[PDB]
Write a protein that binds this ligand. Sequence first.
Ligand SMILES: Cc1cc2nc3c(=O)[nH]c(=O)nc-3n(C[C@H](O)[C@H](O)[C@H](O)COP(=O)(O)O)c2cc1C
Ligand SMILES: Cc1cc2nc3c(=O)[nH]c(=O)nc-3n(C[C@H](O)[C@H](O)[C@H](O)COP(=O)(O)O)c2cc1C
Lengths: 321, 321
Amino acid sequence: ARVKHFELLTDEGKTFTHVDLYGKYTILFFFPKAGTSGSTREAVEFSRENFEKAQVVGISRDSVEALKRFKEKNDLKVTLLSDPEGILHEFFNVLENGKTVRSTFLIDRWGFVRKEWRRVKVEGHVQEVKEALDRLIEEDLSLNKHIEWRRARRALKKDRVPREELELLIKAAHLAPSCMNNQPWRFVVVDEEELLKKIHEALPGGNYWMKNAPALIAVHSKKDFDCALPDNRDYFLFDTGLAVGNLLVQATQMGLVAHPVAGYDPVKVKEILKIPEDHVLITLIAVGYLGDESELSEKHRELERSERVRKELSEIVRWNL
Amino acid sequence: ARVKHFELLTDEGKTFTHVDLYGKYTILFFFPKAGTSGSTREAVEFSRENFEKAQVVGISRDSVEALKRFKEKNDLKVTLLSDPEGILHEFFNVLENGKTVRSTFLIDRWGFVRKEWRRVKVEGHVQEVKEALDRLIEEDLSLNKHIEWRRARRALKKDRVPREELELLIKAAHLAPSCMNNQPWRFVVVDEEELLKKIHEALPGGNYWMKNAPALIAVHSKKDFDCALPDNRDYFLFDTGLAVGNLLVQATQMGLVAHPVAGYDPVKVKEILKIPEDHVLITLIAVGYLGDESELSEKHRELERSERVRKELSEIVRWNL
Ligand SMILES: Cc1cc2nc3c(=O)[nH]c(=O)nc-3n(C[C@H](O)[C@H](O)[C@H](O)COP(=O)(O)O)c2cc1C
Ligand SMILES: Cc1cc2nc3c(=O)[nH]c(=O)nc-3n(C[C@H](O)[C@H](O)[C@H](O)COP(=O)(O)O)c2cc1C
């Protein structure tokens, strides 16, 4: 769970709070009492490592003065928290039979606990924690796996997608932010065969692959549904884009292809789906489980099995001036 | 890894391929030989259990006929694959000195191996696999955690965000899809202090909170950078929204607040950053680690850890007609 708001004094008499957890990874190590052999070893061993993108914080029920002495005598280079009242000891549930059970936690940049060790054995502990931290940082500070995996796949199974799954795609989309929280996005989820077959007639030849999709999501909006600000800053389609971005990530996580297209007759599709004529039908999203690439044109099959194609980063981003 | 393309015959003599793994979760259990005591028990126990949203597939080097008999004798309700040539036995690496090691795999809807058991002990195995599958399905088929956690947070620390982390936000954005792969999005990442101060003067007072951000990302595009199709379907801002949507997910995973705004003077900011006059500056994204909400206005403070505010789903989605 997330670490609650709190305030504790450090070995330096300073106030350490939840805010001091934010923006860093934290190794939080609970020890029973400053000065003992095992706890001295643990603190010294944590102190002598160099943790990439993390801080080390020791915590016990000791007094500030005791912790200060503990640090001074061992030349410790970590923060120590005095928790005489056991506020965090209780929150992390490290007390048993009234005594502290040596325990260690990894906390992320939002303050969420990501890993724990209970009934810690000091021998080998720091190295195990170090290795777990490196793995956690590798996981979080690398490209999101769903963003990376999402492709404009065109091979779709005909198997029906359960409505509860389709609905989750919409729920995720709806959690996008928007100007003034206008939420300008609108969706028509189509999973009725007869309706689908009518929409198929409004598709160009190159979108034959959409005909396998057991579901299509029509995404529409209207300018006055959102902010329209100076210098041509109309937000309705941008914000709807934020929503569809979420939708594709959610689909990819769920093992669904969600492929937004522009290839269709908008007037016909709006007519079929009874979408107001003054709305923009900005995309039609084909949704389905992954199917059989051998049904695709050679061109589409090659796009599908080939690597991502993008401009060099320098063509789309500049740093300062 | 992802499962190779293959075709094998089932106990019914039907062809089963990797396409038959797609769109389902699969428990694939290898056993050395049909009819032995342990393998009989394993198959019987898998068949008796219920696995929601998954299929159970046994596989050995036995003939189709031997598998048919094995199924009939034990009233098995699973698919069995005949693999005399050891095509999947080799791929899954279950052969030790040419002999099959009892092994089981969980494969997701994309065909990725998500969990494995090797040198399997039959007793308790089916239950262990059920629990692991249930957990797998729980995570994949629930709301994406980063989408769920992303909020328009306004308390930002002044702490520098390393360029390697800022680079990753842009990389994730650039992996968005776009009409004709046009990639219409453009970014100026600002982290130089004096440049940030100039931008601050073009912000309205109500966006005071942005002035603590150590980085601002200016997002701009132009209509002719993307598809412009009939019925008022201009794609440049929609597609840029897809990109920013990815950016926000990536930031959230990394423990960064990424908060897109519309409160700024676009002409002033474009001038400061040398963005061409005919571009639309559609958002400024404040990026930073989470800071102290106590520094926010009373209204913003209440919002900082408030519940999500959205329209009811029925207001933004319709099913079919
Ligand atoms: C708004 C939009 C419309 C698209 N329209 C089509 C389409 O009509 N037909 C099609 O085969 N692909 C279409 N695509 C898919 C793109 O061609 C694809 O995203 C792009 O080539 C990049 O490939 P990638 O997403 O796998 O990285 C569309 C994508 C977007 C964002
Ligand atoms: C395009 C856009 C512009 C926004 N502009 C501002 C802004 O100028 N100032 C601000 O305090 N919040 C702004 N927001 C944040 C929204 O108000 C916020 O996303 C909305 O209230 C919903 O909150 P949530 O994202 O936490 O769910 C903007 C959001 C978007 C998508």
